[PDB]
């Protein structure tokens, strides 16, 4: 909630489709970069980087 | 450690030299404070080079000079009018680039100030 | 839209030229003035488009690693608010820089203690020093009003890394104006400069009103392995064993005694009391600072 | 558990020694043999504590930046799969090293060409050859062990090409690419004055391409010209990242990245091909992240 | 670079095979040969190194005191005697250039995928 408030911030708006529910929920709530606060900006970075893949642009 | 003086009461038209001396210290200036409105600069002057800046409102009026050795410099104010009541404020100054805004260089550091009352 | 500043591709204790700054923002919605000499040599001056609000994120650098402590850098702060600005405002943007890494060394033998061949520091432990990192830089981000200086935010540095880790800390703000802009305690290792402070060596980093460079590494570790990791542009203070302290409004402690585990601290970042706060302070970078303005609706 | 690998504080070209990763691991969960010499050299043995699953997350490191190309890094590469590991297996690990920045740069001529002043190289371009200012390709960082007598790839996390020297005045990142067939050749990156990444099998052609796992995985070397020009050159990372010229080198990788043929001055390294084996179950895709080393986390799954 | 293998044959149970592995153009830098055997439907597995200078050798469990290794550096050969040969045994026998990360860790063949045709053994 406030983590989700630094993240958009860091990573501004970004789109992903129904097919990359998976692939966010696990980069989102399980990994080390986004749960944890001084690595939010890989967290930014990572989201960023699955929602121009192919699959999560539809 | 600034002292100003030279200020007084004057009608419009009339002339005032203000004096400044500093203690310890590139360039010099003078500000003013009227009632009800902010500080702003007034005249600024390099020890070395003598090169001067005024704002608009006091071109052509105003000549800032200095003394080197007696660590003092002064403000000459002539054609006085009402809108230059305020009091005045000597500072060393710095500037980022020409054209922006002059500063006191050390920061938040100020004299008493001279009173000017220019009455119509 | 949109407008970021970094600092233009400088490293090290001195600000960027504006050479440098012409050449990073070429093609990209941000043209500076560069401060060419004296107080604010380095710092970017960005006229601001037009009255309304805009969102100031400002980030600390982080500081330097230690030779052998490097697992991480301490990162430099974030710090973010909503500013209401007027017609003809321009800001004044100091980019922090990355308090030095003391490794790869400068030199041959402090490269050796870089590889872990050489324990003489520990063991001397004519005083033979080094191994520490330099404080990162503070971000600053200010205006001149009223004939003075005004700071609007001020992103602190991270201090930097101890020569040593252990066998086996809050973000801290300041909102008043008034509040004392004082830098780090330190010793041989530096502690970082703030608002106003006064340099008490070469090694503490230096105060925005000093021109901010960061401090130099102590000159017992240059007399031991002819080299030391410097502070970062933005008041980061210089190495010795123990690391420098960060920039800020106030700046880092660094050890008053190098001890040989003694991390700098971190500045003291700053938000104008005027402004909306949007996120709170936050560790977050890795490297050099930047700052990042945007409109806000 | 959870078990962090990193460089042991070592950067450039070459990997880290026992010393280095003896202190950095000292009082974790990590206890590694680093390679002493030879192929392996640099390379981290991890005997596996127990048999089961283990999520594996490897990342490549970062190329470097150039001279006058300095606003952001191409970011090693973050992939990830779960293992099945049984009793008595092992892992080597080669983390790797970022690619060296062009700046500061290593001697008086390569420091005043990052202060901007200097116009020599690309006056000299464009017109014994002028050459200088980019960035060394990223090392990839490789998970594998020995199966049946072979080196086995498990993961390759890709490293990031290096930076060219310039880029276009009216400049306003690529796909990460992935390999997940075992039989795929692991050969290198085109290149020339710059340094082509190293892939798993690649043979190096100069000093300055990546080396290959199979060479010892070395970081390429700065370019030979450009050290003439500038008394200085920014070399790959250790883990293949290919050497720079003016043109950056490539990322190594399973393949390694292209790097131009030209030494083009505004022609930046290509990433390296990360790799994830077949048999494991993906947990993520591969994704730019890296901003310096690489590294890799093992935690139980 | 080269390398051949030869010896094979069918033996019964007991009794004993001597393989060979010569090498051409050698690598002065690859310091120890192996024996690796592939039976049917199994991995290959390692059986035997040795260093080519001090001819200090390295057994599996399942071949130590029946297999022993040696090499002739002059001839650039190795050998394999195999006595006490039991049924287990059969299987492509192959030679290769090997390398270890460091002592006590597996032996791999330093010249990745690069295996000869072996020489086939059946007990
Ligand atoms: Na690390
Ligand atoms: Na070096
Ligand atoms: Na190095
Ligand atoms: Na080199």
Redesign the interface.
């Known amino acids: 909630n406030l983590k989700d408030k630094f993240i958009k911030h860091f990573t501004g708006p970004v789109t992903f489709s129904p097919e990359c529910s998976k692939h966010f929920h696990r980069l989102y709530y399980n990994t080390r970069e986004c749960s944890t606060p001084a690595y939010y900006k890989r967290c930014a970075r990572l989201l960023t980087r699955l929602a121009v893949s192919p699959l999560c642009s539809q | 450690q600034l002292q100003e003086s030279g200020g007084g009461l004057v009608q419009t038209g009339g002339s005032l030299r203000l004096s400044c001396t500093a203690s310890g210290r590139l360039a010099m200036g003078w500000f003013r404070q009227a009632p009800g409105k902010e500080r702003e600069f007034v005249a600024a002057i390099s020890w070395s080079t003598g090169i001067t800046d005024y704002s608009d409102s006091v071109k052509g009026r105003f000549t800032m000079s200095r003394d080197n050795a007696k660590s003092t410099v002064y403000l000459q104010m002539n054609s006085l009018k009402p809108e230059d009541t305020a009091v005045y404020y000597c500072a060393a100054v710095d500037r980022h680039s020409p054209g922006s805004a002059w500063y006191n260089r050390n920061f938040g550091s100020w004299g008493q100030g001279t009173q000017v009352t220019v009455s119509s | 839209g949109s407008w970021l500043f ?1 600092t233009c ?1 400088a ?2 204790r001195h600000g960027p ?1 504006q ?2 700054c012409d ?2 923002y ?2 990209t919605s941000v043209v500076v ?1 560069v ?2 000499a ?3 040599r380095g ?1 970017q ?1 960005w006229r601001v488009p037009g009255p309304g609000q805009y969102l100031i ?1 400002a980030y600390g650098a982080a500081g330097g ?1 230690g ?2 402590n ?2 991480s850098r301490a ?1 430099g702060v974030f710090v ?1 608010a909503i500013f209401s600005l007027g017609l003809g405002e ?1 800001l ?1 943007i100091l980019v922090g820089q990355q308090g030095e890494d003391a ?2 060394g400068g030199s041959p033998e402090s490269q050796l203690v ?4 050489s324990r003489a520091v520990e063991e001397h432990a004519r005083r033979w020093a080094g191994g520490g990192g330099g404080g990162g830089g503070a971000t600053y981000v200010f205006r ?6 005004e700071p609007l935010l001020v992103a602190a540095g991270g201090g930097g890394r101890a020569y040593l880790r ?3 800390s809050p973000e801290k703000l300041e909102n008043r104006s008034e509040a004392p ?1 004082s830098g780090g305690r330190g010793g041989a290792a530096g502690g970082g400069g703030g ?2 402070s006064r340099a008490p060596s070469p090694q503490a980093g230096r105060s925005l ?1 000093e021109g901010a460079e960061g401090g130099q590494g102590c000159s017992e570790a240059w007399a031991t392995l002819g080299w030391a990791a410097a502070g970062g542009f933005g008041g980061g203070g210089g190495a010795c064993t123990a690391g420098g302290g960060g920039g800020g409004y106030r700046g880092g402690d660094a050890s008053e005694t190098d001890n040989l585990w003694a991390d700098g601290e971190d500045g003291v970042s700053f938000i104008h009391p005027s402004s909306e706060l ?2 709170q302070p ?6 050099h600072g930047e700052v990042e303005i945007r409109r806000h609706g």
């Open positions: 970094s591709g490293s090290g030229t050479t440098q050449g990073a070429a093609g003035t401060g060419a004296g107080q604010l710092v001056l994120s690693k030779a052998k490097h697992l990162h973010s321009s004044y490794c790869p870089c590889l872990g061949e001149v009003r009223a004939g003075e200086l252990p066998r086996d802009g608002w106003t009103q949007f996120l936050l560790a977050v970078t890795e490297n």
